[PDB]
Design a binder for this molecule. Structure first.
Ligand code: HEM
Ligand code: HEM
Ligand SMILES: NNC(=O)c1ccncc1
Ligand SMILES: NNC(=O)c1ccncc1
Ligand SMILES: NNC(=O)c1ccncc1
Ligand SMILES: NNC(=O)c1ccncc1
Ligand SMILES: NNC(=O)c1ccncc1
Ligand SMILES: NNC(=O)c1ccncc1
Ligand code: NA
Ligand code: NA
Ligand code: NA
Ligand code: NA
Ligand code: NA
Ligand code: NA
Ligand code: NA
Ligand code: NA
Lengths: 710, 710
């Protein structure tokens, strides 16, 4: 027998399941990235022959492959379902999920029950990926496929942007929910539901391994009105309102079908569970024909429209004009079928068009008819189909781009020139100003180091790499709702902004550029106070966004209700402060060593929310030294718990309290990885490395949102 | 609630526990390494003030700290136990474990029950680490501490080498055993024992969380003769024979004591389980005094010698001259105490020397008296103490250096000039020869590409980064036992060596240098055959080792009984072929993208063991192309299992068998990470990237053991 920890279960994880998952900070690194260190996907994708790609992708739609034949000779429905599921994992609370990384090709998502047979759809796109190569990411390809499908089936799509860079392993940072089985009912142990069927907060799906809701009803029990409530809830958590939700649902089901003509128990394991002979595919039926008319996917069986290969007004025509009742598909799934349909409305067999099959609606489709608010939108869409096609095209674009970040990241010839509000638009800022002059005015203000640093931190800290929202570009901190957020210390913030707005007015640098420049100046002073002279790198050009281009409600999810870096917690939460710091740090894109130096430096700069002294382990606040680490690692002190999220650092000999500290401070001296970092920075020889690393991490955070730069 | 996978249990690991643990290949990367990319510990440690360090470390031995006072005012015993436990995790079967990485400061090892209170010992060394900084790794410091302790307590140690570079997280590649509890009896479910109490093979300890054996007896039942069997077995798996084993045991227990004066149930959680207030420490007693005379560590209580602060002949004097019986320590542990000791032989209280305490022996100590083979060595050591001190000093040096690799890695002023056989010595090879001339002779031989490449691969593939043994330096492939290993294809190997020995003789390049140069030539030709002209980088200087300096039995553990890279398996094993490939790849130091290109390239070069065609998915064998990937990713084929570790690749349309393949081949098309890599290399635009990456990986492997270079 061999001594390799060679399968995934063998681990430290079993022994101390509560430990911080620091691995989420060291993802997507060089040893996993198979590309050269100078590869730049954005510059490559700019060279892609898009017109040629569009042509090949359109041709693929009607180029049936015999190992997974196209329904009616057209892969369009499959491809739209692929792209909808790719995008459909997004959620607004943390920005995680979405189509922006091509994550559907990796675990767990490649093997979710809701993604059954999308393994074949991905595989069908391989010859195109093979052809266009490094200039076409799987992520962009997967995001594009359904858009091209809509074009080929007769819908005028609103546009498309390239620019999604591929990843090479699962996104380990994404918590998909608490369950340890696929699609368990909402009364299971480990439920994602609390209280009065309230869906726990980051989550945007009703159960583990579904995209949004259960097509058969809540917990598998048909009831259109309860299904509607779940639809409304899950879709809102994916940034969509009633109109967008009805449009998306109807528009999706205007094409394609449900596959459930066989026995679902005969499908082989999902892809991560299948053995090598299945070619990275899953759900393979080796007992009977599992393809064409015998395909089984969701278990429901039928098409929503008479002509599932084309964009039309079939969906509301069927739904609204027929009356419907519950039936069981051949695989045993609940579905709705129409009472007394006409022959001529029956969709035909996917292999032989001389045979007629059946129409179907899911519980979510029936919701669009029975929920009184959806019913109104549905009737509008049936009576005004041009409006329907417009709203649908726009919502489909939003769906597939909502995690792409600012328009500065978008590439390609079909990028819409409109600025949509959900792109959080920001104009280009003037770059032709004297930086030094601005710095001199900042220094000559009487704003302290702590005011300066806290304000620039608070402006940048909202950035999240999950969907590329937030950050210092735009100076949205000066606008509603940010300017009144409790974590942002609105009085201190109003005080600093009054000054810095004056400076911006006077110099023609944006308020955004000045906020950042000012934090640089506070850091610079703090270093100078330690006898270190440095100038921090600085890139001008940030714009100031307007209130008109700032969706107030959509910014709610970026509010800092916790920020370990300023020892801030708005309330007492169930998660530990240090887990919350890890989460925020992962969204900022920071590594564990970065996280560590930032904490130590921010602490000694005197930047804690409320001017608290927790973790301020220095006799010289305002001076950028490694004191935090020196003192944290000093065994002349013992640490005594002193209530909620608080500790006394006491002298072992005198039994006097020297400092206080929170769990955010003390984890850097407790966790064995973080203390190893703390010890490195507390070494006699690493005072200058500490400053230099602090600076580099500061700068990283100030520039996180600068996609406008090249 | 927040959407971060923020604690270690949240994972893909739960869902598909059988999946390959590819993370073990992407360890110790840039995002975890807090040092600058140009930091080089070897060049820094060369600048360390060793004499000053020796002085500080010696002073620490008698610089008692009040939070964990030194027994009798001397930390020596604690520090030797620290260093022995650090080194004592080594095992020969895979080279994993040992003191060579400073792993004791990270999970799981920092919290093993056998490492109780070594958290305090590590902490006590922090002020020295803080002082010497980046020029002194925690790894070297921990390895050195016990050596300096022995010096200060009167023993002439044999020497010491610096050069162990620190790591920054647990070694995820090390499988420590199957149990999910600490120290369970050998009849538990999940036992590491098979058959007739046969210890499963990589493992070198009798249970989970112990270093070697149970000090209270087998499964906690005292019986010196059964304890002896476990001692003999575990120590042999750590490279030590009877003489070294008795010397180590006696020499360790010549100093220090067992701590068990209290109740073990009152000790707080081990370090990874303790909360933030414990300062990364563990086992803290908050209910009563847990320090000094009230310390509890193993639960046994007493010292082996009258004078535990000094090197002497107390150990065999006590053991051999007193008769012993079983008693229970105050913590409730079984131990041996002497019948009728004299007052004057009783070790005194650790805080107050006017109080006498007790002598003790463990079951392993009694083994040294009762096992008939140990008894003889013990009497030799008692009658010849100079011999004892010599053997012990040498074995202690071996213990602490056995995973350091060749002497070329050793640094510092106390490196022994002797070449010990366990360092696998190799001389410097002549570097002043004409490389091209050698290449021309190789090319003009009639040795094929496959002979050339296979032979260089087989010479290098034995390298393992766990203990830095093996590799192409030394040309030990031409010697016993390697030249007759079945995986090395001894006839083909004898045929190639006859030629290449001739070339080496003729040119004054070592046989080692020529073996590698020859593989480069085979690769070069193969590329030329594809119309690509490259010259592979090459570093001369390898030596040819002698039989006299090659310990035949110790090389047994490097035999290639499996090597996916040449589609080789010596027998049918319980582990899957792909898990075995992952293990080997991790020991070679390769990343997953490296592993991937190496497989594809080796396959098309025609290098499989036995000249098999499994995975040879080309019509042009001998030509270095990306054909393997092109064909592997082609859905014109289906894959049919065809017995053990074998598959047929069949044309979907004709149902004819086109190629055959093993699991090692097909996992690269099945695993979702590996197929993502396979697809990258099968892209129309990546023929040259494939060759270039192949070459870079080839070169990496050929140079893995070249510590002689700078
Ligand atoms: C609102 C909740 C939704 C539910 C419960 C739902 C449910 C389903 C189900 C059960 C299938 C059948 C899958 C199969 O068996 O092959 C399916 C197919 C599909 N859905 Fe949805 N859907 C929803 C929303 C959407 C949206 C928002 C889109 C796109 C805008 C979409 C587009 C599609 C398409 C194109 C197919 C056809 C697949 C094919 O022809 O292969 N659906 N839907
Ligand atoms: C052969 C099996 C061995 C067993 C079962 C064993 C067992 C133990 C036990 C139970 C303790 C007491 C720990 C405590 O309660 O503080 C201990 C202490 C120690 N052992 Fe071993 N030991 C073994 C081999 C070794 C070796 C090979 C070395 C070094 C060459 C060593 C050196 C020490 C030292 C120095 C201490 C004293 C710790 C102190 O004074 O704080 N032992 N041993
Ligand atoms: N063999 N296939 C059928 O008879 C069938 C197809 C679709 N819905 C119901 C039945
Ligand atoms: N259920 N059948 C399939 O998923 C399949 C059929 C043929 N080749 C690959 C996959
Ligand atoms: N319980 N429902 C499912 O397992 C399922 C749902 C949608 N597609 C496939 C399977
Ligand atoms: N309080 N400590 C004792 O009485 C003791 C110390 C060591 N062995 C036995 C007893
Ligand atoms: N059992 N007691 C201890 O481990 C300890 C005592 C004082 N400070 C730190 C640790
Ligand atoms: N069962 N034995 C133990 O748990 C143990 C052994 C050695 N040191 C501490 C604890
Ligand atoms: Na790389
Ligand atoms: Na996202
Ligand atoms: Na239609
Ligand atoms: Na330094
Ligand atoms: Na780094
Ligand atoms: Na090792
Ligand atoms: Na002694
Ligand atoms: Na290329």
């Amino acid at each position: 027998m061999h001594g390799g920890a060679t399968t995934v279960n063998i681990s430290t994880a079993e022994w101390w399941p509560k430990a911080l998952n620091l691995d989420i900070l060291s993802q997507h690194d060089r040893k996993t990235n198979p590309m050269g260190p100078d590869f730049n996907y954005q510059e490559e994708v700019k060279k892609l022959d898009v017109a040629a790609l569009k042509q090949d992708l359109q041709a693929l739609m009607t180029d049936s492959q015999d190992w997974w034949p196209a329904d009616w000779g057209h892969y369009g429905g499959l491809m739209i379902r692929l792209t909808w599921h790719a995008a459909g994992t997004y959620r607004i609370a943390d920005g995680r999920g979405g189509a922006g990384t091509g994550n559907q090709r990796f675990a767990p998502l490649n093997s979710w029950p809701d993604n059954t047979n999308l393994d074949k759809a991905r595989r069908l796109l391989w010859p195109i990926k093979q052809k266009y190569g490094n200039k076409l990411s799987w992520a962009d390809l997967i995001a594009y496929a359904g858009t091209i499908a809509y074009e080929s089936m007769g819908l005028k799509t609103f546009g498309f942007a390239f620019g999604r860079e591929d990843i090479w392993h699962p996104e380990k940072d994404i918590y998909w929910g608490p369950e340890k089985e696929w699609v368990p009912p909402s009364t299971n142990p480990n439920s994602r539901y609390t209280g009065d069927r309230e869906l726990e907060n980051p989550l945007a799906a009703v159960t583990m391994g579904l995209i949004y809701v259960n097509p058969e009803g809540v917990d598998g029990n048909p009831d259109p009105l309860k299904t509607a409530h779940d639809v409304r809830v899950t879709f809102a958590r994916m940034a969509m309102n009633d109109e967008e939700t009805v449009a998306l649902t109807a528009g999706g089901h205007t094409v394609g079908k449900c596959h459930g003509n066989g026995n679902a128990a005969l499908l082989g394991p999902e892809p991560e569970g299948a053995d090598v002979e299945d070619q990275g595919l899953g759900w393979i039926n080796k007992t009977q024909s599992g393809i064409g008319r015998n395909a089984v996917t969701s278990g429901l069986e039928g098409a929503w429209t008479p002509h599932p290969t084309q964009w039309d007004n079939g969906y509301f025509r069927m739904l609204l004009n027929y009356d419907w009742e519950l039936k069981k598909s051949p695989a045993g799934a609940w579905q709705w079928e129409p009472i007394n349909p006409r022959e001529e409305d029956l969709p035909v067999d996917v292999e032989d068009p001389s045979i007629r099959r059946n129409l179907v609606m899911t519980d979510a489709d029936m919701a669009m008819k029975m929920d009184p608010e959806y019913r109104k939108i549905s009737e509008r869409f049936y009576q005004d189909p041009a409006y329907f096609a417009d709203v649908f095209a726009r919502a489909w674009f939003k769906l597939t781009h909502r995690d792409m970040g600012p328009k500065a990241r978008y590439i390609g010839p079909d990028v819409p020139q409109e600025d949509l509000i959900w792109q959080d638009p920001i104009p280009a800022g003037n770059r032709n100003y004297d930086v030094q002059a601005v710095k001199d005015r900042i220094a000559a203000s009487g704003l302290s180091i702590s005011e300066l640093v806290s304000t620039a931190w608070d402006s940048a800290r909202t950035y999240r790499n999950s969907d590329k929202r937030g950050g210092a570009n735009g100076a949205r901190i000066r606008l509603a709702p940010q300017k009144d957020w409790e974590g942002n210390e609105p009085d201190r913030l109003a005080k600093v902004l009054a000054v810095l707005e004056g400076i911006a007015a006077a110099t023609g640098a944006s308020v955004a550029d000045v906020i950042v420049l000012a934090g640089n100046v506070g850091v610079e002073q703090a270093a100078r106070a330690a006898g270190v002279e440095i100038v921090l790198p600085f890139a001008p050009g940030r714009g100031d966004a307007t209130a008109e281009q700032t969706d107030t409600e959509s910014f709610a999810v970026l509010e800092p209700i916790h920020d370990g870096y300023r020892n801030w917690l708005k309330q007492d939460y169930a998660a530990t402060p240090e887990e919350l710091l890890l989460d925020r740090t992962q969204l900022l894109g920071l590594t564990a060593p970065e996280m560590t130096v930032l904490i130590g430096g921010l602490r000694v700069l005197g930047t804690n929310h409320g001017g608290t002294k927790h973790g301020v382990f220095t006799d010289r606040e305002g001076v950028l030294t490694n004191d935090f680490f020196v003192n944290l690692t000093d065994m002349n002190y013992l640490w005594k718990p002193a209530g909620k999220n608080l500790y006394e650092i006491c002298d072992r000999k005198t039994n006097q309290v020297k400092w206080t500290a929170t769990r955010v401070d003390l984890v850097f001296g407790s966790n064995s990885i973080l203390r190893a970092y703390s010890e490195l920075y507390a070494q006699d020889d690493n005072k200058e490395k500490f400053v230099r690393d602090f600076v580099a991490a500061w700068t990283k955070v100030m520039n996180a949102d600068r996609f406008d730069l090249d």
